[PDB]
Design a protein around this nucleic acid. Structure first.
Length: 271
RNA sequence: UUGCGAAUUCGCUU
RNA sequence: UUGCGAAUUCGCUU
């Protein structure tokens, strides 16, 4: 059966304006990273007009364009594409339900990203918290570049259902020896040692700012006892995390952002 | 424009 | 050997 390959093109046509940026976030135009999502089908998709999704960075125009058609794909790659499609909806978006898949340029030409897919399948941070053994002779090593476009997960808690945070900022002027925001602890180091019996091998690493990854499923409209949830969500966002204590997720942050738009788009397309 | 957990008071059936 | 709904007080993050 011949295939049709469609790109879910994405542009931030209207950036979030000041009076709407209450949380004072950075703006993230999806068109600043080449990797993105597309749709694979056994039957073509009728020409649908441009429609908006409303994101934290503002108004993103969605566009479904045909990449290729009438081609064949090996059963092997189809099994790969399908496994990925399932991965994004159950493990990445945590939902319950032809094929959605990542695309990326080859060197202007956009194509199915099989390498990136095999990477995800090979990651030991694809599903849960991985086991990493830092000692004095093999201390945690900080690579600033690995934290430029990342989603992270605390290795030390929430084993059942791990949290995922966007790295919002890297604070080069802080260390695990920096003063703790709460008085009962002098330092982050002491805090993680006192509370979680955690020891650090690297006392010179910058600390990380974080932003929660969760969002509502429907973004077709702008976001413009519940008090207890607001206080909690606020402290969640104000958390400062130690890089050594977190695992980096194989899905980069700029693609994680595009992925949370997907239910809004599939739902729109099929209605 | 996003949480689970524990108490407590109360509405809803014939 | 089986419920949903509304208030309220509180614990859990850094």
């Amino acid at each position: 059966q011949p295939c049709y390959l469609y790109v879910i093109g994405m542009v931030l046509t209207t950036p979030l304006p000041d009076e709407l940026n209450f949380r004072r976030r950075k703006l993230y135009p999806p068109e600043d990273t080449t990797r993105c999502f597309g749709i694979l089908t056994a039957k073509p998709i009728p020409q649908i007009p441009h429609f908006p999704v409303y994101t934290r960075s503002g108004e993103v125009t969605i566009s479904i364009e045909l990449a290729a058609s009438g081609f064949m794909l090996s059963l092997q790659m189809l099994e790969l594409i399908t496994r990925l499609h399932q991965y994004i909806f159950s493990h990445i978006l945590r939902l319950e339900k032809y094929c959605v898949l990542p695309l990326n340029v080859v060197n202007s030409t956009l194509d199915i990203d099989f390498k990136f897919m095999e990477d995800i399948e090979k990651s030991e941070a694809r599903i849960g918290i991985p086991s990493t053994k830092y000692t004095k002779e093999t201390p945690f090593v900080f690579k600033l570049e690995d934290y430029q476009d990342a989603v992270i997960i605390p290795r030390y808690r929430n084993f059942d259902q791990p949290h995922r945070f966007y790295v919002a900022d890297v604070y080069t002027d802080l260390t695990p020896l920096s003063k703790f925001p709460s008085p009962e602890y002098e330092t982050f180091a002491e805090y993680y040692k006192t509370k979680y019996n955690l020891d650090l091998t690297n006392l010179n690493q910058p600390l990380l700012d974080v932003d929660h990854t969760s969002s509502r499923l429907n973004l077709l409209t702008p976001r413009h006892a519940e008090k207890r949830k607001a206080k909690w969500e606020s402290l969640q966002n104000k958390q400062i995390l130690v890089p050594e204590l977190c695992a980096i997720h194989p899905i980069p942050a700029s693609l994680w952002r595009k992925a949370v738009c997907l239910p809004s788009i599939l739902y729109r397309l099929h209605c």
